[PDB]
């Protein structure tokens, strides 16, 4: 049995049953990368860089074999690799997402006809999303409260699976000392790296394992808005870090500060689970029309407002600071997500959450089909039976989360001089202070593109008239 282990998500060696499930004569780990699909992506540098870096340290974490990065599409590549390498077993980590499943079905059948036996394990999520779905009347739980009550009636998730030992990793190796299966660079993928600077969120399993022990440091606010070195969201999205490891390593630490915890200690993960679960069987999950759980709301098709939002040229420092940090770094705090999402959708521009999905998909490291589409539907009150809460003022919420104005100042430098008392609402500053800050509103930095008081009174009506012909 000469097996192939296919990395798609799940970019780790720890907790990988599917990798075990391939390790018993010869084994190759591959990843399929279409280089001019990448060259044409529209997904920004930050994600591609995190992807490559994940792949590079994994190539390192295999040298102790190597990593084959096959170029091409999954179809018309696996047939070659089958006949050429002589392949029996194809293994990979399961993919709950509509596209993935349907793609993975084709491969399994296309592997079946060719006499290749497929085995897939489930380690991206804590649970078996299908197990949750049955236990709940064969439908997905449409409220997080519902989803939670059922997570406590159930059996604690599987524990982190024993990572592969060096003893098998010198029994079924291989090599052909040419790197033609070498991991590409950003330039290779059609990216310009003119004075890049190091990533803020370095990709990879080694980073994520390092970050996981710094995070679970026992003894431990604008600070929180800034990228944390203990932060773990991108590593979960790509799978450099197992969510099950993260689970029980919380549990083993929670038990060292005392019982059995509320489901909220796993807050980061249960929302994630919930969104995955809600999406497995929902092909149109990231869309308004044709989606059985999304409320049909008349958003404004409005490219210009969208672009201004996307580019951090609203009149609002707090919004623009957020979008600026997003474009540059690939991560923004959850509460900042809420701010820009509410602004784009029901709070201010009344633009479709789908458009929000698309921008975050391009810029945000931890976004995937399920979590990203899920968050936006929640935020825009489009799904998940939500009590419409209920405003983030594009001014007030900024002042409230960081009165100093040090978040704005770091990200919108052309606004440095402004006193805290005006930094969130620069247009309300007299020409005196504007001048002394070296920043004339309407010139160095745009005026606000909506009157928020007038806009949110308006939009409140619209949503109400939606829910009233519904309830």
DSSP of 32-62, one letter per residue? EE-HHHHTT--S-HHHHHHHHHHHHHHHHHH
CA distance 157 to 145: 19
- Distance (Å, whole) CA 69 – CA 182: 6
CB 316 within 8 A of CB 448: yes
Tokens of 162: 């024993």
Nearest to 383 by CA among 470, 254, 306: 470
Residue 301 contacts by C-beta under 8 Å, 6 or more apart in sequence? 352
Q: 3 and 89 in contact (C-beta within 8 Å)?
A: yes
Question: What are the start and end residues of each CATH 3.40.50.620 domain in the chain?
Answer: 1-123
- Are 269 and 247 spatial neighbours (Cβ–Cβ below 8 Å)? yes
Residue ranges of the chain that CATH labels 1.25.40.80: 124-160+205-282
Q: Name the strands in the sheet holding 67-71, side by side, starting at the edge strand that comes first in the sequence.
A: 67-71, 26-33, 2-6, 89-93, 117-121
The tokens 């247009």 sit on which residue?
427
CATH class of the domain whose range is 283-468:
mainly alpha
**Which CB contacts under 8 angstroms, 24+ apart, belong to 404-411?**
404/222, 406/222, 407/222, 407/225, 407/226, 407/321, 408/317, 408/318, 408/321, 410/226, 410/321, 411/320, 411/321, 411/322, 411/324, 411/325, 411/328
Residue intervals of the chain classified under CATH 1.10.579.10 are 283-468
Let me know: does 395 contact 426? Beta carbons within 8 Å. no
At 145, which helix (H) or strand (E)? helix 144-152
User: What architecture (CATH level 2) is domain 124-160+205-282?
Assistant: Alpha Horseshoe (1.25)
Q: What sign has the CA pseudo-torsion 22, 26, 29, 31? A: negative
Distance CA 355, CA 301 (A): 9
d(Cα 308, Cα 452) in Å, to the nearest integer? 16
- Report the alpha-carbon distance of residue 385 to residue 52 in Å, rounded: 39
Residue keyed to tokens 């003894």:
219
Tokens 């720890």: give the residue.
14
Which residues are annotated as part of the binding site?
Answer: 233, 268, 334, 366-368
Taking CA atoms, 394 is separated from 129, 275, 336, 455, in Å, by 37, 27, 10, 12
- Residue 139 is encoded by which pair of tokens? 């439908």
Angle of CA points 368, 372, 378, to nearest 5°: 155
> Is 1-123 a CATH 3.30.830.10 domain?
no
Q: Report resolution in angstroms.
A: 2.7
Residue 431, CB-side half-sphere exposure with 13 Å CA sphere: 1
- Which position has the token pair 């990533």? 199
Q: Are 412 and 445 in contact (CB under 8 A)?
A: yes
Binding-site residues for FAD sit at: 233, 268, 334, 366-368
- Please name every residue paired with 33 in a beta bridge, in sequence order, or none if there are none: 71
Distance CA 234, CA 54 (A): 11
396, 398, 415, 450 from 446: Cα distances, Å: 19, 18, 11, 11
* List of E strands, 82-185: 89-93, 117-121
Please compute Rg for the chain using Cα positions.
Answer: 24
Task: Give the three-state DSSP class for 5.
Answer: strand
Confirm if 387 and 414 have CB atoms less than 8 A apart: no
Indicate which technique resolved this structure: X-ray
Other Cβ atoms within 10 Å of 71 Cβ, number = 15
């Amino acid at each position: 049995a000469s097996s192939v282990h296919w990395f798609r998500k799940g970019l780790r060696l720890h907790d990988n049953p599917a990798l075990l499930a391939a390790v018993a004569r010869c084994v190759r780990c591959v990843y399929i990368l279409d280089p001019w699909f990448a060259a044409s992506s529209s997904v920004g540098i930050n994600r591609w860089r995190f992807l490559l870096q994940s792949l590079e340290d994994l190539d390192t974490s295999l040298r102790k074999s190597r990593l084959f990065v096959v170029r091409g599409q999954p179809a018309d590549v696996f047939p070659r690799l089958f006949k050429e390498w002589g392949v029996t077993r194809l293994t990979f980590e399961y993919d709950s997402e509509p596209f993935g499943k349907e793609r993975d079905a084709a491969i399994m059948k296309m592997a079946k006809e060719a006499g290749v036996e497929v085995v897939t394990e489930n380690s991206h999520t804590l649970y078996d999303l299908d197990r949750i779905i049955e236990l709940n009347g064969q439908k997905p739980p449409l409220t997080y409260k519902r989803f939670q009550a059922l997570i406590s009636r159930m059996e604690l998730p599987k524990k982190p699976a024993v990572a592969v030992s060096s003893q098998q990793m010198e029994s079924c190796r291989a090599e052909i000392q040419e790197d033609t299966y070498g991991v590409p660079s950003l330039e290779e993928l059609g990216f310009p790296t003119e004075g890049l600077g190091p990533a803020v969120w370095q990709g990879g399993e080694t980073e994520a394992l390092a970050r996981l022990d710094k995070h679970l440091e026992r003894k431990a606010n604008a600070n929180s808005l800034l990228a944390s070195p203990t932060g773990l969201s991108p590593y979960l999205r790509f799978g450099c870090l197992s969510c099950r490891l993260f689970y029980y390593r919380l549990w083993d630490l929670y038990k060292k500060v005392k019982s059995t915890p509320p489901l909220s200690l796993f807050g980061q993960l249960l929302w994630r689970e919930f969104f995955y679960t809600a999406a497995t069987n929902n092909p149109r999950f990231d869309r308004m029309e044709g989606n059985p759980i999304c409320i049909q709301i008349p958003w404004d098709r409005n490219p210009e407002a969208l672009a201004k939002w996307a580019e951090g040229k609203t009149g609002f420092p707090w919004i623009d600071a957020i979008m600026t940090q997003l474009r540059q770094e690939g991560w923004i705090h959850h509460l900042a997500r809420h701010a820009v999402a509410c602004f784009l959708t029901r709070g201010d521009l009344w633009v479709s959450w789908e458009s929000g999905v698309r921008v975050f998909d391009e810029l945000l490291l931890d976004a995937d089909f399920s979590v990203n589409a899920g968050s936006w539907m929640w935020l825009s009150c489009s799904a998940f039976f939500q009590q419409f809460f209920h405003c983030y003022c594009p001014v007030g919420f900024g002042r409230r989360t960081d009165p100093s104005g040090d978040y704005i100042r770091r990200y919108l430098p052309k606004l440095k001089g402004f006193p805290s008392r005006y930094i969130y609402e620069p247009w309300n500053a007299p020409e005196s202070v504007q001048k002394a800050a070296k920043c004339i509103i309407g010139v160095d930095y745009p005026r606000p593109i909506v009157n928020h008081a007038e806009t949110s009174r308006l939009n409140i009506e619209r949503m109400k008239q939606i829910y009233q012909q519904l309830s």
